[model samples]
Target: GKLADLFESTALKAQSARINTWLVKGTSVDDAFLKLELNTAGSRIFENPKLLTWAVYVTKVENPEEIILAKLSKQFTEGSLAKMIASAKLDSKTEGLATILQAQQRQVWVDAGKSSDEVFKLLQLDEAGTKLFKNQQFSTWTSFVDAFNRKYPEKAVSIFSKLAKTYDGFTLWKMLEAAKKVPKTEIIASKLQAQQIDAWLDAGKSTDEVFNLLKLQRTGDKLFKNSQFLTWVSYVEKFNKAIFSKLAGVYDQVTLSSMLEAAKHVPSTKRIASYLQGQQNQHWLADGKSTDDIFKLLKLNTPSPENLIDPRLDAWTSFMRAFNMANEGKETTLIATLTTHYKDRGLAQLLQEGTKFASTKKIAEELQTAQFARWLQLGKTEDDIFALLKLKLTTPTTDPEAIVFYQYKLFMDAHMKLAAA
Candidate 1:
């Protein structure tokens, strides 16, 4: 106890001279008072009588109870050591306006950090203290609102008016179910006025306003299935209810079915199995809706593997890109047109079968038609042929078979008046 008293005294004396010097100047006495308020031992009242007197009277007082009480008092008031010593010298508990003001400021600082284990001896404390522990402030209010909302759905729903202004109308529709009370007028107005309202809602007014709001909208095919949109939806769900509703609606249908599947009588897989089977035939509805419609419906369509499959035949059209083989001849035009309507592989297979009767190459040769025909179909230039003949057909073969083919080809060309006859 006496040790605490001695520490307080030393501290006050050290700060007194500097504090007085400032007080004597034209500087505001308020500053000096604040300085002295912190520096003075007058705040540590309990420690003074117990500790200081004990250091001298401890030997005479043989009772252990008094000594221990004095020690505990000294320890407790050490928290206000500077105040305690000042109290002893002044011989009175005289903390005035300046001290009261200083204490208020100090209390605010302490309250901010008062939620520590040291604050309540472990029992739950009041709002201010708890807020300090939880670090609640305007900065964290929104996040707190979310945490609270998630825990209490009914209460969260009641706050919808406050939350409605936070996001786009499309988002609010999705979170409608989370609120306790649905303001039907607001819901109806929001649904009708919302962007892409047609896509979001189906004709609806229900006995229950919340139900109508919940049922008013459905997901559109485009936005829900877009990989980029899905990615964004995932991010927005963290703080935005509209975003969360859209995400949850899809997730819950499947997740709940999965839970049921695990039940004894209720087949846990029943919902999922039905869903998978229905999807095979009903994927059209999913793939047909636009983003606005999906928003209006509040359909939380998630990124399913099935949703990513392009049902609009975009993938089928892409398959035609490989058939662009010809440069510019009649062959190019014919093949291009054919490919536009039919798969090239199908045409190639048909040709293969027709040749089974005889070697198609030999038929082309004996009939003396394919060479000229293919080249003509391609509209190959005479100059192009001449170049090909000179460069590609290098050997001058006088062989009869070769001569026959050449003669026929030349005769066909001449007959066709290709030589400017």
Candidate 2:
């Protein structure tokens, strides 16, 4: 942890000052260490030149003592110091990351190569030989491909041809994702034929793996469109309703069944509707069930057209017009919700001239300046009606009241908290 001690308590006295000066004067600590430099002070560099580019270039040149060795020494020491003082603040995060990677067994294998295999055999390590060595070879094969293509293309082509015989197309792809070899390397991977690759992939897996693998492909689409895709769709519908009703919108036949089932357990049309038309994939909005399996979905103040209407265009059109105040006191509730939620200076104007719902003399006259017309609406409750002095809407029944507390908390706890703060 004490990187300063590496300098201060060390036998290498002159090296400490040299390292310290580099740390303080450097433009970027990572670049300073990775590239042999006190700082890029002289160069009027282009905007945001890449650190990896400079570091990789520096590694390529054989100036190990001046550039790399000195840089690594200072980096390890100063990096340790920074980790204590200000973790995650450094721009060049690669040094510490490299240290971590170096500590891993895979990295050790990469470093030691066949020496690692010898140790595996010496210890008679079953897991090492079976899994670890295979993984190491796989990595080697990949890296060899990259390096071989660039360094010895002919050699790479020969080895890759051999690999092509044993591995499937998917396996080859996985190997390629890990490879560092370039086309210029000894193996010359570019020479391989596409037909041979396809043949290998075709014969690679079991029936299930092949089906699952191809499921996302063109072949998979045709297969998925069969009864299996319908079954999957049915499962999603049930999940959206029974499991995620409070948080997710549900309207399909399957989801409707789930929602109806959930409604039976706790009967509130708002809860049912919220489950039917709540936020997708966000924290669930409150309507019926408070905390119980509501799952997580964002609660919306306005009615969402998702699960309320059918997916068909005709049903959707009817769906939008169906849910005004008559269906769920939506008009009045929207005004109240908006007034309570938003923090605009023109709130008074909106309250006054916002909607036909706010036609009552008291609300129209009193806060006659709120300007957020889209958000202003009133509640259909007795108190709300009395405050606005209009009573066109029906009083909510026991079921709506039962779920209102949860909504009240949502407004008060999260919504109003932000306003108060």
> Which regions of candidate 1 fall more than 4 Å away from where they truly are?
1-137, 140-161, 165-222, 225-346, 349-421
> What does candidate 1 score on TM?
0.20
| Predicted structure 1: lDDT | 0.33
Off by over 4 Å in 2: 1-134, 137-155, 158-164, 169-421
Lowest summed lDDT window (length 10), candidate 2: 289-298
- Against the reference, the lDDT scores of all candidates come to 0.33, 0.34
Alpha-carbon RMSD of each model = 21.5, 20.8
Tens-place lDDT digits, model 1, residues 107-144: 33243433222222222222333122222121123333
